[model samples]
Target chain A: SLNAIIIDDHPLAIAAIRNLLIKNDIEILAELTEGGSAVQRVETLKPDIVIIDVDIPGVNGIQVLETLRKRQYSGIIIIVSAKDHFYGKHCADAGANGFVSKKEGMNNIIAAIEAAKNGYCYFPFSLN
Target chain B: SLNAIIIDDHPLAIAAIRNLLIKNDIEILAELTEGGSAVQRVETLKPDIVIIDVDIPGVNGIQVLETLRKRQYSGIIIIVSAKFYGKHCADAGANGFVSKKEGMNNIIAAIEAAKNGYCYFPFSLNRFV
Candidate 1:
């Protein structure tokens, strides 16, 4: 029922999330591998959710999260990564709607999506 | 320095928490594997902090959390587990939920959050997983 766009460098990660979205009935608008044109595409296409990998090359995940927020994108923004960092909390501080991990697999992504659809921001409460 | 007690069936989990507490200068009074005597221990020991794993075989983590709150244990209660249920821990009165999936430093983060009066839980809901 919700539409989403995913930005990640790994094909496996993208496919897994994309498949999960489709299987769960969430539409996929686009899949980006870089942060370069992410902000513009997001503004133009307007997805209900944006799932990003914080470790992508160039224009890293954090900058994109902050930029979209500054641009006032009210849609949910989910930051996915394999590792936890102190600055990972900055994703929450920068207005990411959700911060999850790839290691947690597809289930976590689903919960974040379900929780956000109900008007809640999902992050490690510690990140707050 | 803080006075604390840890509850976990696994010795490694206990040692991990105990060492972290000790390194941070928090004293550990007792380490219990089961949740049955947890309330009594807290009632009598009265440590400044209580670290528990909700996934124990005998005692439910949130049950102790709610019970301690009901008994008015005043000290902090933190859930350091392999599992996480944000709303459950939050509603039951936990100061933090640190995942075993992440680095041990996160436990410190949870402790700091408690000292500042905030509850820390993970974004991922492993409760259903």
Candidate 2:
């Protein structure tokens, strides 16, 4: 089972994605409700994947992803948020391996994990 | 702007989907966190679309969709859930199935597809649900 960490300020968002990951056989190593300490915990834990919510108040989820990438954390990074694909592209530009919207559905999360495991980027392919 | 109704128990989930719809220019007609009155709401609203969450307690999301369809409600129906495509939702009469993991962009795509009289199921699995 792949080890993973989740970072989201909203308890519901965190629980929703956590349940999605667990149901898909991914092990949860840690969960952070804020990004202030995410960089440190991710550095210490170094799990296979880190899912961050872009709507976090203080640190900002994109900033957290960039920080982790800058620190040379080689694990996959996924950004989860209520925002749309424009936000997903922003996170992608910031070094996220994938972006999952709370509006999309759970299957996208599973697809993202599988894509990350295969050394591929997972994100939406939009018409516009 | 196209009018639409949303049915989902989770507040955050409702807000997320609502933002998606609004960003795509879909107007919000009504919002229901439970399925108990979703059918009646959709029937009364007669909006362009109805987005339902599959995990609502008391009233199942799929059941709500079926109920709306049964009432001769001719409108778009999208299933929003943190679950996989089971290959039965479309057969059960959903116009679209959007995975929460796909992000809001895909939801927009699904909406557009449904608006244009096409089914929107965005996943490689491509099953029914």
Candidate 3:
């Protein structure tokens, strides 16, 4: 049973990702369109997972990840945005559990989240 | 002097960026429609910059970025779309986001920003919505 929050600005993309999560039995707590209020919601709702887009309003994705890590957030943080090796490395270093590229299709996103739900890491580059 | 290619489906948006770059003295390597044609053009031409639309008909924007990235094309990339996909472009290794809201008023700034490893995302979050 996985519960989480989604943060992407595109309505079309959001709708698609929403279906994928619901069909996979992952409960969506909130769907945000920007970086604002993300940390606050995580503090208040405390969902087990956070799926955020790297390009969000109010703040960039990596900054949000850094803030969460600094705040000692123990929940899974997955970046569901574009694919960049640079951002992937930053995400992994910032303690995110998964980094799925929108270029990889919905199945790939599901697998990344699924892996995180099962206590595994999904990143493009090895943490080594 | 920077040389670049533009990938977009819409005639208006594509022409907008194309004309601006030409005036700015940036070389226009090629202008392509949404399809599988981009990767190879980018691979061989090796332009200094690439401007692509997010919702192109062919392979879409992200896939193109991914393939080019894997090919070791470390040139600047900019995502052009209605959405404020600045970070999305950055996520896929693009360096800029030229929102078509101003017909892209900040393109010069965006291009300039990329050279220093910084991204350009104008403050038009309210325009698309």
Candidate 4:
């Protein structure tokens, strides 16, 4: 049972991920919308996994990942983005453990979480 | 020229509204996702119209509407919800409400109704409640 936190601007998307994660035996600690305070939240929660969206209200996902890493958060970080391969590469460079595009639907998201939990990277071969 | 701001979590949904409103000559001032600070944002932006979704992060749409009304925000509020009715959107002081699953025309119709100072609901009132 892995404890995780979700940070996404879209409520529907967050809900979708929440349902999928629950079925995968993941406990959701919190759901955050804005990316500005993500680092502090992640530090406080100390969740095993942090699933974040690339496009948020402020301080994009890549920056959030950088901030978390700089703060010494060794937890798994998975970026769920609307963009494609280029964004996934950017997330990887930013220290994300996994990358899942929103266009890939729930299966990829579940796969990303599972892969991140197992200390492996999961990224789709093609993203739209 | 009606100035509007949108508060919804879905980027795709926001983009849909943006395209439809742009065609209707509505100026989009800003887009917000979290509903916790929605009251302050709406008060600050002071747009002529506010289009919000029911299921938003932090606070729900009804609560957002209640806060705006309590804060004396006289601008038009239209609720774009996945559930068409039974949320008492109109009773909660929403000038108009529409279903996102109903397609773009309904949202466009709601905007037009608000612009004309009329209340709009895509479905019949008796259908849900």
Candidate 5:
């Protein structure tokens, strides 16, 4: 059972993630709003995975991953953002273990969690 | 005259970019070997642009840009890779472009694009996005 955290300011986004996790049977460590809080929580919780949004209040999601690296958090980082190639690859470059497009469904997010746990970086191979 | 820095594992790549800059009259603020140091340098130097190779001993070029953003370094990033779509898009996300096979003229466009604060094209966009 992989434990994960959802970091997004939007309540609807959080609810969506919660529903997906519940349906998939994945454990939810926490749901955070601010990027600063997400960084702090990520370090303290060290959950198996982190699902973050690119556009967030305070620091942004990529900055959180940078902070994670600064503190040497070993857990996998999975970024969930709009279908922007810039943000996706940027998060991956930030040592984020995985990335899933916002519109890609929960399956890809789950796949990212699995891939990150296995020490593989995940990025969408092709997009139309 | 644009200001730039070169980050690569190979001494030859550094020398080549240096020569290219010298002949083109671009100024080189510093030359770095490791991605870790390059990240710090980019933040401190605040050069007009950065030239990096994809593969490096530590952290890699893409990783360095991540660190730079952590520091919020906002210089134009121009990635010089051999030829790989993965590396190109990866670095472009880090806010840079791929200029591996592009000629010196294209490199100019890259610099101009970066200087103008317009997003640069990291890849050739060959039937793939």
Candidate 6:
């Protein structure tokens, strides 16, 4: 079973991702909702993939990516967001390994995680 | 002469920008020392351009960008930073008109203002709890 960590402050986003994964047979080891909590969870849980949202208060998603990189985390990080343009650029540049637009369906998120697990970059290619 | 507002909270960075502008013949209208103050100042000062630092106490650079966008403040907002690639991507997605490395030339501030939200910056380690 694939281990996943959902890192969104929104209860609905978190629940939706969790339900999607559960239905797909992915095991959720944990879910984090705050910037600081996500950092700690990433360090401790070290899930196979982390689902991150970019606009969280305090540290934000991009910062979390950098933090994981700094800690030498080698796991897959899949960024999920609704914000356009800037949010996408940040995730890609932060080397998230894979990204899923919140606008995209849950299947895309699953596909992103699969790609990330295989060490493939998964996100819509953008020139912005 | 560019009317710029420095939003770093760091006295040294603020002074450095001020001095560089002075040396380069740029006119800095004001400097903001905190994030809370920055939000209010941006609303009132209505500067032609704003130079913001990523790491701050209360509100961060991205949130600041959103707030300005929410208020329909169309003035130039240039993000200044020394962080690596991530900040750049965030700035780009946030509709950051323009962005530059803190280590880059001071003149980029002027360029960002001219173009508005096209350029970008980078960021680092996060913790919200």
**How well does chain B match by TM-score in each candidate?**
0.90, 0.89, 0.86, 0.89, 0.76, 0.68
- TM-scores for all predictions: 0.53, 0.49, 0.48, 0.47, 0.48, 0.47
Give one digit per residue, the lDDT tens place, for model 1 in A17-96.
99999999989998899999899989998999999998877798889988887777878788898765354456666777
The parts of candidate 5 lying over 4 Å away from their true place are: A126-128, B1-129
Worst 10 residues of 2 chain B by lDDT: B120-129
Every model: Cα RMSD to truth: 12.4, 14.8, 15.8, 20.1, 15.1, 14.6
Give the candidate number with the greatest TM-score. Answer: 1
Instruction: Evaluate all candidate structures by whole-model CA lDDT and list the values in order.
Output: 0.76, 0.73, 0.73, 0.74, 0.66, 0.63
How do the residues A70-125 of candidate 4 rate in per-residue lDDT, one tens digit apiece?
76777778788765456654666577776776774777666555444433345432
lDDT, residue B55, candidate 1: 79
Error of 4 at B116 (Å): 49
Best by DockQ: 1
DockQ, 0 to 1 scale, candidate 6: 0.02
Residue B32's lDDT within candidate 4 is 90
TM-score of 2: 0.49
Per-residue lDDT over A75-115 for candidate 2, one digit per residue giving the tens place of the 0 to 100 score: 87878767554665465557677777677666666666665
lDDT tens per residue, model 1, B3-110 = 998888877777787888889999989988888899999999999999888776666878988889888777778787774375578767777677776657777766
For B1-129, candidate 3 gives per-residue lDDT tens digits of: 789998988888777788899888899989899758999999889899998888888887889987888788888887777644554655667666666665555666566545633444432212211
Candidate 5 lDDT (Cα, 0 to 1): 0.66
Candidate 2 lDDT by residue in tens digits, B21-105? 7777889999888888888788787898888888977789889877777777777787888744523676677777777765666
Per-residue lDDT tens digits of candidate 6, residues B1-129? 656677877666676667776776557777776688777887887776677777756788767866876677766665665434334434343323222333435335334323422233222223211
Q: The CA-based lDDT of model 6 is what?
A: 0.63
Q: Candidate 3 has which clashing residue pairs, if any? A: A55-B87
Query: lDDT per residue, candidate 6, A19-108, as tens digits?
Result: 999998888998776787787887887687788887776787888888887778777777888645456445666767655667645766
What are the clash counts of all predictions, listed in order?
Answer: 1, 15, 1, 1, 0, 26
Model 3 is docked with a DockQ of: 0.02
